[PDB]
Motif scaffolding. Structure first.
Motif, mmCIF file in Angstrom:
data_model
loop_
_atom_site.group_PDB
_atom_site.id
_atom_site.type_symbol
_atom_site.label_atom_id
_atom_site.label_comp_id
_atom_site.label_asym_id
_atom_site.label_seq_id
_atom_site.Cartn_x
_atom_site.Cartn_y
_atom_site.Cartn_z
ATOM 1 N N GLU A 179 0.794 -1.221 0.000
ATOM 2 C CA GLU A 179 0.000 0.000 0.000
ATOM 3 C C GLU A 179 0.828 1.273 0.000
ATOM 4 O OE1 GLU A 179 -2.470 -0.257 3.445
ATOM 5 O OE2 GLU A 179 -3.715 -1.880 2.631
ATOM 6 N N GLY A 180 0.442 2.201 -0.869
ATOM 7 C CA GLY A 180 1.110 3.485 -0.957
ATOM 8 C C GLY A 180 2.600 3.500 -1.228
ATOM 9 N N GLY A 181 3.121 2.449 -1.851
ATOM 10 C CA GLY A 181 4.545 2.413 -2.143
ATOM 11 C C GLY A 181 5.361 1.691 -1.085
ATOM 12 N N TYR A 182 4.683 1.173 -0.067
ATOM 13 C CA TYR A 182 5.353 0.441 1.002
ATOM 14 C C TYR A 182 4.804 -0.970 1.107
ATOM 15 C CZ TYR A 182 7.460 4.725 2.787
ATOM 16 O OH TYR A 182 8.239 5.854 2.912
ATOM 17 N N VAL A 183 5.585 -1.860 1.707
ATOM 18 C CA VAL A 183 5.129 -3.220 1.936
ATOM 19 C C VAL A 183 4.766 -3.170 3.414
ATOM 20 C CG1 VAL A 183 5.672 -5.677 1.918
ATOM 21 C CG2 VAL A 183 6.660 -4.179 0.179
ATOM 22 N N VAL A 184 3.510 -3.471 3.720
ATOM 23 C CA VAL A 184 3.019 -3.405 5.088
ATOM 24 C C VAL A 184 2.772 -4.775 5.698
ATOM 25 C CG1 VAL A 184 1.234 -2.424 6.571
ATOM 26 C CG2 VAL A 184 1.957 -1.161 4.538
ATOM 27 N N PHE A 185 3.449 -5.037 6.810
ATOM 28 C CA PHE A 185 3.306 -6.303 7.508
ATOM 29 C C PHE A 185 2.546 -6.098 8.807
ATOM 30 C CE2 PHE A 185 7.177 -7.066 4.960
ATOM 31 C CZ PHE A 185 6.831 -8.244 4.346
ATOM 32 N N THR A 186 1.633 -7.021 9.083
ATOM 33 C CA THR A 186 0.838 -6.987 10.300
ATOM 34 C C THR A 186 0.834 -8.394 10.890
ATOM 35 O OG1 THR A 186 -1.175 -7.190 8.925
ATOM 36 C CG2 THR A 186 -0.578 -4.983 9.700
ATOM 37 N N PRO A 187 0.557 -8.509 12.192
ATOM 38 C CA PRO A 187 0.557 -9.829 12.825
ATOM 39 C C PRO A 187 -0.560 -10.792 12.498
ATOM 40 C CG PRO A 187 -0.232 -8.204 14.388
ATOM 41 C CD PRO A 187 0.254 -7.431 13.162
ATOM 42 N N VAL A 188 -0.213 -12.075 12.495
ATOM 43 C CA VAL A 188 -1.220 -13.109 12.333
ATOM 44 C C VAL A 188 -1.745 -13.259 13.765
ATOM 45 C CG1 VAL A 188 -0.239 -14.223 10.312
ATOM 46 C CG2 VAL A 188 0.579 -14.917 12.599
ATOM 47 N N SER A 189 -2.794 -14.049 13.951
ATOM 48 C CA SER A 189 -3.420 -14.206 15.264
ATOM 49 C C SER A 189 -2.521 -14.393 16.474
ATOM 50 C CB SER A 189 -4.411 -15.377 15.224
ATOM 51 O OG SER A 189 -3.737 -16.621 15.141
ATOM 52 N N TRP A 190 -1.495 -15.213 16.323
ATOM 53 C CA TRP A 190 -0.609 -15.554 17.419
ATOM 54 C C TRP A 190 0.686 -14.773 17.551
ATOM 55 C CZ3 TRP A 190 4.012 -16.899 15.275
ATOM 56 C CH2 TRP A 190 4.018 -17.433 13.970
ATOM 57 N N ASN A 191 0.891 -13.788 16.682
ATOM 58 C CA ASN A 191 2.160 -13.068 16.660
ATOM 59 C C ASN A 191 2.075 -11.591 17.009
ATOM 60 O OD1 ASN A 191 4.920 -13.460 16.334
ATOM 61 N ND2 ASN A 191 4.900 -13.178 14.100
ATOM 62 N N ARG A 192 1.194 -11.245 17.945
ATOM 63 C CA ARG A 192 1.021 -9.850 18.355
ATOM 64 C C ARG A 192 2.001 -9.407 19.439
ATOM 65 N NH1 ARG A 192 -3.453 -8.490 20.790
ATOM 66 N NH2 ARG A 192 -3.666 -6.398 19.856
ATOM 67 N N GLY A 193 2.762 -10.351 19.986
ATOM 68 C CA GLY A 193 3.725 -10.021 21.025
ATOM 69 C C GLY A 193 3.627 -10.965 22.212
ATOM 70 N N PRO A 194 4.356 -10.705 23.313
ATOM 71 C CA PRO A 194 5.278 -9.587 23.547
ATOM 72 C C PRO A 194 6.491 -9.548 22.623
ATOM 73 C CG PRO A 194 5.566 -11.214 25.247
ATOM 74 C CD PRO A 194 4.305 -11.592 24.497
ATOM 75 N N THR A 195 6.959 -10.722 22.210
ATOM 76 C CA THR A 195 8.094 -10.815 21.300
ATOM 77 C C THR A 195 7.586 -11.502 20.040
ATOM 78 O OG1 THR A 195 9.667 -11.043 23.144
ATOM 79 C CG2 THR A 195 10.451 -11.628 20.958
ATOM 80 N N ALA A 196 7.566 -10.759 18.939
ATOM 81 C CA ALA A 196 7.083 -11.288 17.673
ATOM 82 C C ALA A 196 8.219 -11.439 16.677
ATOM 83 C CB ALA A 196 6.036 -10.356 17.106
ATOM 84 N N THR A 197 8.233 -12.559 15.971
ATOM 85 C CA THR A 197 9.256 -12.803 14.971
ATOM 86 C C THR A 197 8.596 -13.175 13.654
ATOM 87 O OG1 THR A 197 10.975 -13.540 16.543
ATOM 88 C CG2 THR A 197 11.225 -14.234 14.265
ATOM 89 N N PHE A 198 9.036 -12.528 12.581
ATOM 90 C CA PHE A 198 8.521 -12.827 11.252
ATOM 91 C C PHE A 198 9.631 -12.544 10.264
ATOM 92 C CE2 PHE A 198 7.790 -8.679 9.121
ATOM 93 C CZ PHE A 198 7.910 -7.807 10.202
ATOM 94 N N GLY A 199 9.398 -12.825 8.991
ATOM 95 C CA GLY A 199 10.446 -12.557 8.030
ATOM 96 C C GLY A 199 9.926 -12.486 6.622
ATOM 97 N N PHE A 200 10.783 -12.020 5.723
ATOM 98 C CA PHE A 200 10.415 -11.931 4.326
ATOM 99 C C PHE A 200 11.667 -11.934 3.471
ATOM 100 C CE2 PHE A 200 11.632 -7.464 3.629
ATOM 101 C CZ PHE A 200 11.554 -6.918 4.899
ATOM 102 N N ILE A 201 11.482 -12.210 2.189
ATOM 103 C CA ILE A 201 12.583 -12.204 1.245
ATOM 104 C C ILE A 201 12.211 -11.212 0.159
ATOM 105 C CG2 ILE A 201 13.871 -13.461 -0.538
ATOM 106 C CD1 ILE A 201 13.285 -16.047 1.232
ATOM 107 N N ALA A 202 13.135 -10.309 -0.155
ATOM 108 C CA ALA A 202 12.917 -9.315 -1.197
ATOM 109 C C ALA A 202 13.876 -9.638 -2.337
ATOM 110 C CB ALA A 202 13.161 -7.895 -0.676
ATOM 111 N N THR A 203 13.460 -9.362 -3.566
ATOM 112 C CA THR A 203 14.307 -9.651 -4.713
ATOM 113 C C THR A 203 15.474 -8.680 -4.785
ATOM 114 O OG1 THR A 203 12.979 -8.257 -6.189
ATOM 115 C CG2 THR A 203 12.361 -10.597 -5.975
ATOM 116 N N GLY A 204 16.619 -9.190 -5.224
ATOM 117 C CA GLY A 204 17.796 -8.350 -5.336
ATOM 118 C C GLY A 204 18.650 -8.344 -4.082
ATOM 119 N N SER A 205 19.790 -7.673 -4.180
ATOM 120 C CA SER A 205 20.746 -7.571 -3.088
ATOM 121 C C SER A 205 20.472 -6.363 -2.194
ATOM 122 C CB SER A 205 22.148 -7.483 -3.687
ATOM 123 O OG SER A 205 23.113 -7.322 -2.672
ATOM 124 N N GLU A 206 20.120 -6.640 -0.940
ATOM 125 C CA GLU A 206 19.824 -5.609 0.051
ATOM 126 C C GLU A 206 18.970 -4.484 -0.522
ATOM 127 O OE1 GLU A 206 23.258 -4.654 2.679
ATOM 128 O OE2 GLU A 206 24.324 -6.140 1.460
#
Length: 98
Positions: free
Chosen positions: A54-81
């Motif tokens: 949305e709006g030129g950004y990739v927006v990540f939000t939590p799934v049901s069980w990943n709201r905290g206190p410590t949340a871990t998620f990840g993604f892979i983007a194309t290209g180098s850094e």
């Protein structure tokens, strides 16, 4: 930043780049992580979160069980850094940024 230390990022590059994110929130929140990618790059894989472009950004939000206190998620983007910046928003406030 309202809560420096709430956003931690590990970057691994092999042609495409993996971003492993850990959020240290201290509680459960409907967090919002906004990611800005270099032009021409896109997220090819993600886990433990919902993804929206949305709006030129990739927006990540939590799934049901990943709201905290410590949340871990990840993604892979194309290209180098290709990630230029990562912003952590909680209840409308900018808690931390990379």
């Amino acid at each position: 930043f309202v809560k420096p230390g709430s956003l931690s990022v590990k970057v691994t590059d092999w042609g495409n780049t993996e971003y492993d994110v850990t959020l240290n929130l201290g509680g459960t929140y409907d967090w919002v992580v906004k990611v800005k990618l270099k032009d021409g790059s896109s997220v090819s894989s993600f886990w433990s979160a919902n993804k929206a472009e949305e709006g030129g950004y990739v927006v990540f939000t939590p799934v049901s069980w990943n709201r905290g206190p410590t949340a871990t998620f990840g993604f892979i983007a194309t290209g180098s850094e290709s990630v230029e910046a990562i912003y952590l928003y909680v209840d409308g406030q900018l808690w931390d940024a990379w």
